């Protein structure tokens, strides 16, 4: 029942953020849950986690426990992680599956393509239906070295969602096929998923909110350019910060020899599960990599987590007029907030 | 407003579990809360806890704090555990009440039958009603050596709910009257009460889910026969497992000299408080009895608690088609799931 | 949405408490939140906390984070604690502000009167509206030596809400202007705000529920007189206990040189934030004052917190008939509950 104009934030030079209800309403969240997150490609992992036959991972997004698994035939598949008998979860965590999936409850077994292998005693069950007792699939695709799922059977391909993105990312970081997961920070953040994207889409805040990092880095004339359902923040010692629709962020810091990736998995209007993954090419970490990981964990990320959490609380106040001015300038400077207008302009298209 | 056919699961040979909404909907739970648990006899304890005058226990079921108390006149009574003046709780925990109940807030005193003994200054309050300032009762009955409460004043008697059950239980365990509480495991379980019953009503899962247990024991016949709102699982050193409507289960393991009892006290659609009681006839326990209690606590029960918790999560998934096939076999073998159909057929009569 | 008669508890000699729904319903709370707490003067502190230029405190009441701040010009002001840019909270805790407020997010600065000082880069933002970018004020007034806020722009003055109260309080304690905060107990209490007022408005409970305190003191005359939206419990070495609409209580114990203040900041139907402040005229504390603080913290207050928490649980029971008799005696004795009737008669006017 809450709608946005089709031209909402179409002019970034004179633009404001959503009326606050869009950050807080459970009704708005339920619509975005089905119109956006059940019908878009959702990045869930780096390819290194699913490279070999029988490799699998599990993810939870908008209330759906999903298993992605590389088959014995090396075909990548994704399934709802729920047994078609009486609903027990099939796999937990991540690792290497055996040659069949065995349900922990009554030990029905499934091939890695989801088809029912053996249902105990089914020969003695009247009219047992073998073809509707398979695991339920969804779409999965490998794109740009990462892995995306899609709950909409009618989805096309990741490239139609993020045209040109793979090429640009492989141009910022040429070592993607050999990156390996070094650390993952798991946090349930009490902020709307769009508030966390807003926080990523500008550098207006890094001076005030990231003193130790911005003070040492003399970064001026850093540009934020929009493309097709993704954007690129590029600064100088190159920096790359990609945002991709709806809410996965890829960062290639100065060395261009490593990456950090932010995965946002919305839970409800005021809760978002975040994975903060750090990837290096070497499995054995040096102490310089170990220290860098702890700087991310204990110094950098807490500052951004605190910001979006305070904003979520303030957004409910009757003392917040309703919308915030997006501080875009004529020059599209490094401190311009125009990236927020691009993101919210796209979001508004789902609120017509 | 979610209704089931009257013939739901009337034919166990071709049957499926409830549509998933019945295990997850708060609307369904509120209906079951009032149509079943406020109008059925609810087992709360073994008789040994209330055998002497002034004995009392407290229970919480469907949001109601209940005090069950044996009066000075040796009459067993049950009351809502709330003062008639301004609503302070009257008793906590379990034990021996003094000869009057004294409310901790304004020290009104009540007799063990619920009557107001003395309300201070009531002589000076205009039109004070001594007889509607008594504790509010509900029905209680001793049946089969156990204690049942009922929130419906128009209820009849436990035998009308469970015809023949006491006669049959006393044949399975001839020493019930001499049982004493040896251990109680209290768990607030994140599963619908009906998922927990499903898990009790079949042995399809014992091989897969209780490996250490199914591996040691060579069971030479196993039958699940239905009766009158209760069922009996009987195996061969006999084993007896009774389920009684709505959700109390009584087990008589091989020795037949001790019992374990499962009490389910539903909290909401996705939460059930469970009591797992172990009763032996001797007050001082042997080292083998202590060992058996720890096997139940740390090996056996966690396996069943984990199953129902995983099922409750999987039942919410859009990848669960909706209903699960009840694996009934022609022979009604030891691993047949037909007990579930009987249970769910009874539940369905409450969703007309 | 069930309404009360205009004469509800108009006759204290024959009166009952609200039907239990008024203490538990979220719908009732939402009405009282907007009709009472967003339209009444809410006491937040003693003036001593805001006496000097740049002093500030923060409070939270009915979901609103408020900052009260004494400006460089020595004018006392209050603001919603939310940045007009993108909603980050502005200040935390209490203390001495710098000469401008700096937002932690993007470092907009505000003078202590709420007006925008500096918005970084605003010179390059098209059509930037500086005078609709100030912090949002609400009304604040110093009254009786304490500080009140009001969320209703059309509010008048505290004296219109509490006629004669300041005049009578300064007769109870003549040194209010020299008091200083000696101790504060902060508790999120799981009780409706009206249950907590009930608990304050009678001494019917002091004998049974405060045993160590009742036997210890000698009371030669104790009266509870009602006025205009406030009441006075007065005893003899005088004692004064003031309740003021809606739920701030001021205590002047026998020595009549110190004060105890209860602030209730409701959160929802079943949750109330309480501040219990103890004020002495000397800042450097004696051992007897220090001992007295601990008796309040660990002996006296826990008894009252436990009473209201148990009452809130009991009010939900179907075994509570619905309303409780207010134990008013014809002689308005020391243990008469007639004060509850006065309070509930005032509350009832909002449920017509
Ligand atoms: C894009 N930018 C620099 C604004 C956000 C940073 O990339 C934060 C991060 O990479 O975790
Ligand atoms: C009936 N059966 C054996 C399947 C369940 C077990 O009795 C559970 C139990 O004894 O606690
Ligand atoms: C009003 N009365 C005496 C009932 C309550 C006490 O004043 C509570 C208090 O002083 O904190
Ligand atoms: S739930 Fe998977 S086999 Fe029964
Ligand atoms: S509440 Fe039990 S006596 Fe007042
Ligand atoms: S939110 Fe306060 S300056 Fe950006
Ligand atoms: Fe940041
Ligand atoms: Fe089991
Ligand atoms: Fe008290």
PDB file of N, CA, C and O and ligand atoms in Angstrom, chain A residues 83 85-88 103 105-108, ligand 4:
ATOM      1  N   UNK A  83      13.812 -32.146   3.449  1.00  0.00           N
ATOM      2  CA  UNK A  83      13.538 -33.484   2.951  1.00  0.00           C
ATOM      3  C   UNK A  83      12.097 -33.581   2.463  1.00  0.00           C
ATOM      4  O   UNK A  83      11.180 -33.112   3.139  1.00  0.00           O
ATOM      5  N   UNK A  85      10.201 -36.061   2.466  1.00  0.00           N
ATOM      6  CA  UNK A  85       9.368 -36.941   3.279  1.00  0.00           C
ATOM      7  C   UNK A  85       8.640 -36.152   4.364  1.00  0.00           C
ATOM      8  O   UNK A  85       7.469 -35.823   4.199  1.00  0.00           O
ATOM      9  N   UNK A  86       9.305 -35.821   5.472  1.00  0.00           N
ATOM     10  CA  UNK A  86       8.627 -35.075   6.529  1.00  0.00           C
ATOM     11  C   UNK A  86       9.393 -33.823   6.944  1.00  0.00           C
ATOM     12  O   UNK A  86       9.124 -33.257   8.007  1.00  0.00           O
ATOM     13  N   UNK A  87      10.301 -33.337   6.111  1.00  0.00           N
ATOM     14  CA  UNK A  87      10.756 -31.965   6.258  1.00  0.00           C
ATOM     15  C   UNK A  87      12.009 -31.735   7.063  1.00  0.00           C
ATOM     16  O   UNK A  87      12.333 -30.580   7.353  1.00  0.00           O
ATOM     17  N   UNK A  88      12.732 -32.775   7.432  1.00  0.00           N
ATOM     18  CA  UNK A  88      14.014 -32.568   8.087  1.00  0.00           C
ATOM     19  C   UNK A  88      14.981 -31.880   7.130  1.00  0.00           C
ATOM     20  O   UNK A  88      14.895 -32.034   5.906  1.00  0.00           O
ATOM     21  N   UNK A 103      19.019 -38.558   4.418  1.00  0.00           N
ATOM     22  CA  UNK A 103      18.306 -37.712   5.358  1.00  0.00           C
ATOM     23  C   UNK A 103      18.556 -38.213   6.774  1.00  0.00           C
ATOM     24  O   UNK A 103      18.523 -39.423   7.010  1.00  0.00           O
ATOM     25  N   UNK A 105      16.698 -38.192   9.305  1.00  0.00           N
ATOM     26  CA  UNK A 105      15.488 -38.591  10.045  1.00  0.00           C
ATOM     27  C   UNK A 105      15.123 -40.057   9.785  1.00  0.00           C
ATOM     28  O   UNK A 105      15.119 -40.876  10.708  1.00  0.00           O
ATOM     29  N   UNK A 106      14.760 -40.384   8.540  1.00  0.00           N
ATOM     30  CA  UNK A 106      14.370 -41.738   8.150  1.00  0.00           C
ATOM     31  C   UNK A 106      15.247 -42.308   7.042  1.00  0.00           C
ATOM     32  O   UNK A 106      14.926 -43.365   6.491  1.00  0.00           O
ATOM     33  N   UNK A 107      16.345 -41.641   6.703  1.00  0.00           N
ATOM     34  CA  UNK A 107      17.388 -42.171   5.835  1.00  0.00           C
ATOM     35  C   UNK A 107      16.922 -42.421   4.402  1.00  0.00           C
ATOM     36  O   UNK A 107      17.500 -43.245   3.715  1.00  0.00           O
ATOM     37  N   UNK A 108      15.898 -41.725   3.913  1.00  0.00           N
ATOM     38  CA  UNK A 108      15.730 -41.639   2.471  1.00  0.00           C
ATOM     39  C   UNK A 108      17.041 -41.144   1.882  1.00  0.00           C
ATOM     40  O   UNK A 108      17.732 -40.336   2.500  1.00  0.00           O
TER      41      UNK A 108
HETATM   42  S1  LIG D   4      12.217 -36.534   6.884  1.00  0.00           S
HETATM   43 FE1  LIG D   4      13.738 -37.166   5.422  1.00  0.00          FE
HETATM   44  S2  LIG D   4      13.456 -39.359   5.428  1.00  0.00           S
HETATM   45 FE2  LIG D   4      11.846 -38.725   6.796  1.00  0.00          FE
END
